[PDB]
Amino acid sequence: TELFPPNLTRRYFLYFKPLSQNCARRYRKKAISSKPLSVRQIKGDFLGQLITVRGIITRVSDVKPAVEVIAYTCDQCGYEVFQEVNSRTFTPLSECTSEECSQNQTKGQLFMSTRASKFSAFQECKIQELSQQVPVGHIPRSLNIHVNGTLVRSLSPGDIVDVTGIFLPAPYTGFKALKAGLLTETYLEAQFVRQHKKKFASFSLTSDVEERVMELITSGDVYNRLAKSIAPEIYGNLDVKKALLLLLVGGVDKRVGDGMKIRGDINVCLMGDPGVAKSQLLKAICKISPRGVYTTGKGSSGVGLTAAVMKDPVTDEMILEGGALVLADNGICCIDEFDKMDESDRTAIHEVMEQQTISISKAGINTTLNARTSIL
Amino acid sequence: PLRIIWGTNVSIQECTTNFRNFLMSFKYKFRKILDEREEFINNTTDEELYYIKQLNEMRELGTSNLNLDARNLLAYKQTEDLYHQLLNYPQEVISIMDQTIKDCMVSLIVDNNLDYDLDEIETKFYKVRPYNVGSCKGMRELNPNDIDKLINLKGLVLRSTPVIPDMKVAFFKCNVCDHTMAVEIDRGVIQEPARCERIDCNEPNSMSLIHNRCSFADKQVIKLQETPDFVPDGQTPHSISLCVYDELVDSCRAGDRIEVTGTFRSIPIRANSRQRVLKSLYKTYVDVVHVKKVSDKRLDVDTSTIEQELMQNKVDHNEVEEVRQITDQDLAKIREVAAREDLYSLLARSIAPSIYELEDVKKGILLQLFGGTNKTFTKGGRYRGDINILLCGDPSTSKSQILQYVHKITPRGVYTSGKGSSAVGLTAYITRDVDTKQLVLESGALVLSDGGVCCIDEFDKMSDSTRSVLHEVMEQQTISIAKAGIITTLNARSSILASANPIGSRYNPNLPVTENIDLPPPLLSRFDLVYLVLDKVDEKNDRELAKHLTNLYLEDKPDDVLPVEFLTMYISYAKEHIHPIITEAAKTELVRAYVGMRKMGDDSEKRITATTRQLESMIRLAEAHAKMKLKNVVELEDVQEAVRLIRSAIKDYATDPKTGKIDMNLVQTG
Amino acid sequence: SFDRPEIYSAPVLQGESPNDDDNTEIIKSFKNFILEFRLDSQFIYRDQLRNNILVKNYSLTVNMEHLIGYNEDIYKKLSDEPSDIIPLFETAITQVAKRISILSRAQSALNSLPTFQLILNSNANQIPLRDLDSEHVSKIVRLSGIIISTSVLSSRATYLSIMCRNCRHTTSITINNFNSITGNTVSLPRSCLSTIESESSMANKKNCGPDPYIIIHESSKFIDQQFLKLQEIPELVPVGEMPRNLTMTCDRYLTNKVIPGTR
Amino acid sequence: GLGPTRASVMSKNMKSLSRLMVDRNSGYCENCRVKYESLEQHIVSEKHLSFAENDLNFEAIDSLIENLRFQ
Amino acid sequence: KKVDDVTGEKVREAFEQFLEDFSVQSTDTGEVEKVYRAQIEFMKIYDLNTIYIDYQHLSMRENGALAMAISEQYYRFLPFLQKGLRRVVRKYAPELLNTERVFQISFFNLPTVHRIRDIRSEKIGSLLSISGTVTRTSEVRPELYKASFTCDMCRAIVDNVEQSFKYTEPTFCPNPSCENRAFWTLNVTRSRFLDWQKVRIQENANEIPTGSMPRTLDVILRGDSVERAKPGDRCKFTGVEIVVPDVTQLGLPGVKPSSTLDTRGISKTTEGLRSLGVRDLTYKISFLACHVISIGSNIGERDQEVFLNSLSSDEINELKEMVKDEHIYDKLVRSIAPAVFGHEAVKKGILLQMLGGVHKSTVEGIKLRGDINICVVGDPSTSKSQFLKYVVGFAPRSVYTSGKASSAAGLTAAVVRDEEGGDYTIEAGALMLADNGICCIDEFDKMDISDQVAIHEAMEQQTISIAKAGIHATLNARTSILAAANPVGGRYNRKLSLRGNLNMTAPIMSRFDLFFVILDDCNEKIDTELASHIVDLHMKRDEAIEPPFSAEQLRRYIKYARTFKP
Ligand SMILES: Nc1ncnc2c1ncn2[C@@H]1O[C@H](COP(=O)(O)OP(=O)(O)OP(O)(O)=S)[C@@H](O)[C@H]1O
Ligand SMILES: Nc1ncnc2c1ncn2[C@@H]1O[C@H](COP(=O)(O)OP(=O)(O)OP(O)(O)=S)[C@@H](O)[C@H]1O
Ligand SMILES: Nc1ncnc2c1ncn2[C@@H]1O[C@H](COP(=O)(O)OP(=O)(O)OP(O)(O)=S)[C@@H](O)[C@H]1O
Ligand SMILES: [Mg+2]
Ligand SMILES: [Mg+2]
Ligand SMILES: [Mg+2]
Ligand SMILES: [Zn+2]
Ligand SMILES: [Zn+2]
Ligand SMILES: [Zn+2]
Ligand SMILES: [Zn+2]
Ligand SMILES: [Zn+2]
């Protein structure tokens, strides 16, 4: 008999969680999978191994259906013919390869059946090593992360992340004249994702969280305790740190049935003499916040804050990529050196602090984009 | 036993019987019970068989389409399974629905013995359009397991490709004996004949395809800018491609907010033109089943802008509805509201209930929503009753919220910010299509706003080069492009609603009005109303303002004000069926007011001089006031109210005619 | 560095209605003929196949009159077009024989079962060697005579493994037709098959050349083939005319069954 | 067993679905023009009970009843 | 034997009876003249190629079956009509047979005129009438009509091969010397060609929907219809909706139809040593017109003799009556821009601009401009744009442009690329779309400096130079300019000169003959009269407009007066 193979009957996706460093310390095990590497440290000797990379996510593609096996129907014999796909491109089948058609003189014609075929939710992400991992005088490089199955939408741009996956080679992409032998591209088939900063929307009232929360409540004076611990090595500025804590928490977003909205986020300005450690406060606040962005006033231009229209080649479509006010959406945008900015960024932030959107009407796009940033 | 289609859980017999029972035995009171609305059940409409009378009027009118609400399937007990089968397997369940609709059309005259012939009905191909299939989850939150499911989406149309012929029947001709055959398309593939079908002529490769004899069908591709209800953290908006077929072609225009329900599809794309090699990553699109262009939350589209489009809708039998159907009961309700003595204050109060006071501002917004009358000269001229309003004022005067409300209430406006917009981005531009890799035309903000209101926030921050585009829009309601690929006049009959601050970011009484506004004279004169909305510090005004913004926070979900649905349908009816005209009594008032303002402008720039455009603004405002009260003629009191609104907008009573300055404590009443 | 994608099939729908001239239906009818034929009270062909499996004789002997008795349509298809129908009946024998072999050695306590040979005999009218005409070409003929010479056993190739000279591409050619003479109806491919197959994702202009395959003889399989010369009966020959003869080719279990001089 | 009347001609998509089918008291009410799984469930249904309480569709019957009362 | 088309032959019979039977009554006398035999006789003495058939004449036959057959299946029945016309002209005027002469049937007076966006796929291969504005005209090119081939190995010549759209080679090879069909070689000298033009048309500005951009269509003219359409005019094309292969639909979403070879009756053997031909079915709608007529670009030839020959007796009598009037100049001034009150000097200037001066060339070679360029400057809301609206809605060969919506290429000429190919084409700019007309440019002040430079160059030499890409061209742009400008600072400063009030450069200013500074003065009488005029306009529309002359008689007088060279 020819049965449907097991591969066409899985409803589950299987992933590898790396061993924790503490459990390795208990049991005298030394594993290469547990230790976070940088992109520079991931060499050709790690191919095929389950390894963990630490870094920032810079690019996330849209979720697309990548076909793993293609299903065809034959009207001549009634069989379903499945051809596997393990490459970026494939050639479709025309004549039926089932036993009944293979033996028969007349060959049937195969038609694609997209409901009977197997797809994976596919995303390609770019990971870049942190500034603490870049050596002296070097430019950060990038690594490609392949996300398939359930793990999609677990990576977003601007996330410090430990990604554990299988380091696998791919066919060479580049000029044919520059290759020497069997050159291969590289990627990381993602198996596990650990966020350094957990998202506020991802918070769940689990059992283990409750005793820590109740311990902090029973310790008392949580307002003053959380205020003065924001930047413990910055002396004084108790009320400044209190309003920075209120910046981190924020108020209640209000919606009325008429349709108008009142924002709940708080915007805080620190204007002061030089040497009052306000840049240290900005660094501390949007290092504490899970979705914080630090920005120097002339370091970001008008296109570097609102939006830019550019092409994604993996999904092959012309997409809008936001600036710092998009990367800090549902977070805090740290805008250092506020008084030395241009009028373009001032107008963009001027619209952001009230309507929480940016409207772009240019030669490329006519759109509005959500930016619910709290601005420091 | 019972047969099931492979890959599904769908039985043709079971689904046919269930949907037939649903069509024969549905009442809209079931929808009332399902939506937890018991007190709104009425005897005369809910207890009538809904789809029976809808299929009857479908028979009388020659309509071949049934618009089916999927929530109604959940209202009925027996079709609650079928609802899921409509969402999971639209491709065959829709065909089952079409077949049983045809059966029901036969049955309604077979059983009841009507005089209609069966041949015309059974020749017709009835098809169903399901809509309201569920929650509007985003495109980017969908998964490959959602392929070939019914999905509902919000969006704005950016552009549409021309009519594309997709080939349904193929016509092959023999070269030597001129014998022809016609072959049907089968799942996108046409079998070309290797040998001639004739017994006498069997020559190989003698069949050639004649491209003009073979039959085609309409296919159009529309680029839709999606506006999800929920947007994840840092999600930047995208454009989808949606394919409409047959009747639905050219039913969506560029710049309209629509409700697309369709099928989630995925196809592989060829990597090269010469090769048949396909890409493993698939391209997703929506195969559109039904388009809803009407929301009860917002106004209907202006009928004066789509007259030939409505005629083409009638010709093509696309029969997608553009305006709300007004019944008799709600029409009588519209008249009894229109006869109320305080109708003007009632309608102005019902504009923005969350915005406190600004009564004259709301009255002007109401009159801009109504609009003046549109007059088409037989010689060829055209006058458009579009009211332009500038709101200049101190910060935090709820004016940006007024722009947000107007943007939500208008059918096809565009919200823009000062200097976040460019001159090219307001009119038209050349873009690169991702699909065809071709240079395509795409409409700017002002052209996309035709038939609606263009809201421009921070009008003072806009650069003068960008600001120069608006002149032709406010004077002729057109934009005349002479660029590299475009030499044409585009209709932009959009009402400009702008917001601005003074130079010092706060109004200065020591400075005059014109210096405070900081707009050039050929620009400011095009505005029908200029509102100086100032923040005066009072006891009672601050107390009531604080109470108004503070009662909003009493509960999580917060006189007499009309509901937004009734307000929208009232304004839609008044715009569609009421065209007031000027009488001689109104003419005398208009002329006397214009000469009075010109005489007042004689005194010695520092003050806003009277303008011919101010006479035209008075005419348009009086026409909008007459259109409000459902009068077909403009009386004298309409002109007096227009003059009062114009004078109170700029606060002419407060200002000194000589110096041009405005006092605060003396004349102004908060 | 990915693997070759594999293609598999699974029967779901009924498909188009079967036709009698289809190869699958001919194979099924032949299989039912083998399994269901009774001479007096016994399945003679089923028992013969089992006994031949026990003695490692991978062939079946079938009488042609039994095919007349069972189904005339497959009989006339076999008679008119033997080179298309004989491999189908051999495939039917092999499908029955694998089923018999698996159920035999696992109950009466790796194994490769080759394609079975069709030997078919009949008692129909024997046309003489002088009345062979062009109407008998590619037809099954019954004809009598005497045997003059039997040739030595030549070795024909059934299963042969080939390897490319420099490309190192490994391929296998299976042959089930050895009964042709003076010509290679199956030959090694003219060019390397690694390019057209595209089995490797990397796909490492490189051409391997004309006829680049060599036969790995240690992993190839062979059968025996013999040439016989059949003369007409010298008792019935015209006085002034030389007797006429034919060359015959036999293979597999038909070889070494006769000696020269037998009738 | 009256059954419900149906259209003469079937659709091409409907005929295409016949090739895709595999395997996994009752009657028809002409008053409500629906099939029912059981009669006693069709008796307790909003359309049948709403049809029963209405008397304007048995008017001819009513006239006949009146005539047959005074024969 | 070939199979015949019974309905096609009866359409041929009905058409050849129509060509000899149809007749109308004479207007002047009442005689019965058969107009199509007269048309054939007219073609006989001038050796014409095209026969013009009115569609209303064809609709009168039978109950309308023949006209409906021609309308729905024009592509199928066109060769049958051609051979029917061939038979009729053979019976009547055989001299047209010899020169074989190709004939073209042009249909006109179709009952309905379709928009560009109303074109649907159900009308492919059907007779149609559309309208549009011509933007690009290609040059006349030969099209392979009757190809003559020579076989590669038999090497005998064969001629008169049918050519239908895509290039085809015969597979008959009637000589019995060789045995293959596919291999042939074209003889371009011996083969026959027809004229061919691809003119691109755009949706008319009144027909564009509310938010959408105009969409274009490539209509192809053949034979005598070639070069009957000019860049920038409104033409009504009657023809057939055809379909043309398009390759750019590969990336489009949806199932693209494809064609593969059916293999069911082909015997095969697995001898060994599996390729098939599959080809895409992707297309775009095009048009093939047999009749081109140019309706006026207005809402409603230099020699005078040809103009007065065109007019009939009644309108030439009306023109003579207009000429004879002694107060004609005042009536001409009062008839210009009736919606505008006052500003008689601007109306005089507009009239003189629409008339213009003579063009003179000296013996040295320099050209003296006869075109009058007028700039209207003044205070806001002085009806300075109403004049431009009147000139564009009235004057022939007039275009309207805004200052900021302008461009250097859009006003003069553009070098453009189609389908990302190696071919570069020329878009005619606004100055050439108004050639021997008026280019009306509102907000000349808001125009940037580069476009002002590119337009005063075309005011200097009255020509346009192109050197972009591989295209070097000299283009004719002799055009009067009606500019509207606002002063710097908004209002007009009386204390400053005209140069100080305007940012328009000195080369721009030096070539404007008239500078009309129209100003607002506040006095009760004229403000009251102007307000009364405007409210009467709003009340009465066309009833409030009572000019001395209507637009059509004004245009006839202007076109008559432009023939004079004072
Ligand atoms: N209150 C403070 N407590 C501790 N360290 C401080 C304090 N104020 C200043 N410093 C130190 O002085 C330096 C201040 O650096 P910054 O953060 O750049 O201050 P600043 O206010 O941002 O200066 P700018 O850029 O001119 S506004 C750091 O080295 C701080 O550690
Ligand atoms: N009179 C009012 N009625 C209701 N809400 C008000 C009023 N005045 C201020 N607000 C609210 O106060 C906030 C101020 O934002 P906006 O008034 O929208 O800003 P703005 O008036 O446009 O002035 P800008 O942004 O500086 S140009 C909003 O949440 C308003 O809803
Ligand atoms: N003198 C006038 N005679 C007739 N109509 C006038 C006059 N002045 C103004 N109008 C009318 O008032 C309106 C003025 O519109 P426009 O002609 O666009 O103003 P404008 O003269 O172009 O000034 P700018 O430069 O555009 S601000 C139009 O409806 C005119 O018909
Ligand atoms: Mg600092
Ligand atoms: Mg604001
Ligand atoms: Mg103007
Ligand atoms: Zn098959
Ligand atoms: Zn033929
Ligand atoms: Zn090789
Ligand atoms: Zn019932
Ligand atoms: Zn030849």
Residue numbers in the entry:
A (entry chain 7): 189 to 564
B (entry chain 4): 176 to 733, 739 to 784, 788 to 853
C (entry chain E): 2 to 110, 129 to 223, 233 to 291
D (entry chain I): 511 to 534, 657 to 703
E (entry chain 6): 101 to 199, 260 to 433, 441 to 467, 498 to 763
Could you share sentences copied from the article?
In the map produced from particles of the first subset, both Dbf4 and Cdc7 are stably attached to the DH (State I), whereas in the second subset only the N-terminal half of Dbf4 is visible in the derived maps. The final density map of State I has a global resolution of 2.9 Å with most residues at the DH-DDK interfaces clearly resolved. A striking feature of the DH-DDK structure is that Cdc7 has almost no physical contact with the DH. Instead, the association of DDK with the DH is mediated exclusively by Dbf4 through multiple contacts with the NTD-A subdomains (NTD-As) of three MCM subunits, Mcm4, Mcm6 and Mcm2’ from the opposite hexamer. In State I, the kinase core makes an intimate contact with the Mcm4-NTD-A via motif C of Dbf4. Motif C of Dbf4 mediates the attachment of the kinase core to the NTD-A of Mcm4 so that the active center of Cdc7 is oriented towards Mcm4 for the capture of Mcm4-NSD with a higher probability than the other nearby substrates. In State I of the DH-DDK, the regulatory loop (residues 504–519) of Dbf4, which is upstream of the M4NB, is embedded in the substrate binding site of Cdc7. The N-terminal residue of this loop, Thr506, is situated close to the γ-phosphate of the ATP-γ-S nucleotide in the active center of Cdc7. In the DH-DDK structure from the ATP-γ-S treated sample, upon DDK binding, Mcm4-NSD becomes flexible and completely invisible. Instead, the M4NB of Dbf4 (residues 520-534) associates with the Mcm4-NTD-A by displacing Mcm4-NSD from its binding site in the free DH, suggesting that the M4NB and Mcm4-NSD compete for the same binding surface on Mcm4.
